[PDB]
Structure formats: C-alpha cells, structure tokens
C-alpha cells in the first residue's frame, strides 16, 4: 500500500513544481511529513502548508513558491554516526554552501546544519535543495 507515506507526498510536490503548479493534494500525511514540511518553511523553500482534519488520516494542501529544484526521501533511514554526515551532504547536495539534508535525530526532525550545532546525529529522512 503506502509503506512510506513520506515519499509519496514529496514526489507529489516535485511533480507539481514540474508543471509549475503552486498546489498539491498530499495523502495520507504523517507526523514525519508535518515535521518534514515545517523544516521546509524555515528556509523558505515552500509557502504555507495546511493539514485538513479528515477523521481518516489527514490530507495537506501545499502552496509552492517554486524555489525548489527537487526534494528526495531516504528510506532506508541509514544510521549516521556523525562522520557520515559529511559524506551524505557531499553526494546528493548540489553545493557545500546550500541545500539541507534532513534527519530524524534524537531531539527532533532537524536539518544536518541544525544537527551539527546540537551535535546530535541520527537516521536520515531526506534531502531538500
């Protein structure tokens, strides 16, 4: 069915921005997705997200600036022992300056930049550039 729900929504976002389309209907929106999406907001990559209360599993409408080339999702969530943070950022990020790798860390779903400041590594959720 939808084993990882995360990727299904973020693919929808990519496909949408490939039309240029500012809006997407996301299904079936997780907590991990909400935390993924709040992380986007901070760096301005997407405009406002809104989670509708169906008594089912929650859908989201995305408003999109179009600043985003592409958003990818890591499953399996590979265990980062802090010094693979450096390797993972190099491979899939277009620049050393910019583009956030997204983790599920002990203290929250946080970007690798934020994770480095806290010194808390993790399991890898995602990539956003």
């Amino acid at each position: 069915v939808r084993m990882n729900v995360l990727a299904d929504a973020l693919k929808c976002i990519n496909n949408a921005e490939k039309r240029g389309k500012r809006q997407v209907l996301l299904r079936p929106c997780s907590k991990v997705i909400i935390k993924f999406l709040t992380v986007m907001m901070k760096h301005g990559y997407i405009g406002e997200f809104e989670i509708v209360d169906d008594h089912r599993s929650g859908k989201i409408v995305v408003n999109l600036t179009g600043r985003l080339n592409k958003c990818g999702v890591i499953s399996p969530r590979f265990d980062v022992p802090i010094n693979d943070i450096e390797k993972w950022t190099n491979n899939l990020l277009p620049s050393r300056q910019f583009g956030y790798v997204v983790l599920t860390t002990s203290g929250g779903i946080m970007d690798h930049e934020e994770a480095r400041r806290k010194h808390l590594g993790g399991k890898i959720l995602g990539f956003f550039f």
Binding site: M3, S75, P76, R77
Partner: protein, 143 residues
C-alpha cells in the same frame, strides 16, 4: 525498483548480493578457483615446458598468413598448449625438445586476434630470451 529498502531488511541484501555476484564472471573465476582447476597455468605466472612440435597455424580471414606457433607441454601438468613465438623469425630459435618459457597473451585467456586458439606467448628459448637473440645482443648456450 526492486531492492529491499526497508530498515531491518538487512540480511536480504547480502543474500541477494551473493545470488547476483554468482553471475559475476570475475567472482566465478575467483570463488570456484577455476585457475587451478581448468586453466593450464595453475594461476602461476610462468611455466617452463618442453617443445613437442612446430605448427604452421593458418590465420582467420580476412588475413591469409602462416603464423608460426609451437606445441608446449608444461613440466607441472603435462598439459598441451599452443603458444605463439613473438618477434622475428623465431621458430629457427625454438628448436624441438628445448626448454621454453610459456607466458600468456594478456587476454584473460581468449585467443589472440586473428590467430586460432593461441592463448599464449613464448618469451624464452634455452633460458636466454627470444627478445635478446633477435637483436643479437645474446647468443644461444650450446645445447
């Protein structure tokens, strides 16, 4: 597309990897130890053999040449090899029943170019080398 990309799928990759590496041609040769079993060198870099016969090997088309190979029996295995005599004139240097060094043609087996079934080179006759003898820098030890 395919791969078991789940968090604890962890055995399955190794199992499947070994199932896929089964087909890997270089790993088949290594694991099954084919060098020692089938290949006339036992993965041994050189072999000294005794010259049986000189062979006038007719070339594959579009080349009509008599390309001058030598039948060699290795000392370790008694295995019959046909090896080419590279650089000039050379069968005149080979002489039947001489001790000859058999080396390969750098081709992971596979028969030369247009030369039928000659997987091998000759590098030496009577411990001097062919190579020295053509240039003339050295002269053949008696018998």
């Amino acid at each position: 597309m395919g791969k078991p990309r789940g968090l604890r799928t962890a055995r399955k990759h190794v199992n499947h990897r070994r199932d896929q590496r089964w087909a890997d041609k270089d790993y088949k040769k290594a694991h099954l130890g084919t060098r020692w079993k089938a290949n006339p060198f036992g993965g041994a870099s050189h072999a000294k053999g005794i010259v049986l016969e000189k062979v006038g090997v007719e070339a594959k088309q579009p080349n009509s040449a008599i390309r001058k190979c030598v039948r060699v029996q290795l000392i370790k295995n008694g295995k019959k090899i046909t090896a080419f005599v590279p650089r000039d004139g050379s069968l005149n240097y080979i002489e039947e029943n001489d001790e000859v060094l058999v080396a390969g043609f750098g081709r992971k087996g596979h028969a030369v170019g247009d030369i039928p079934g000659v997987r091998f080179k000759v590098v030496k006759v009577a411990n001097v080398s062919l190579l020295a003898l053509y240039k003339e820098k050295k002269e053949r030890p008696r018998s």
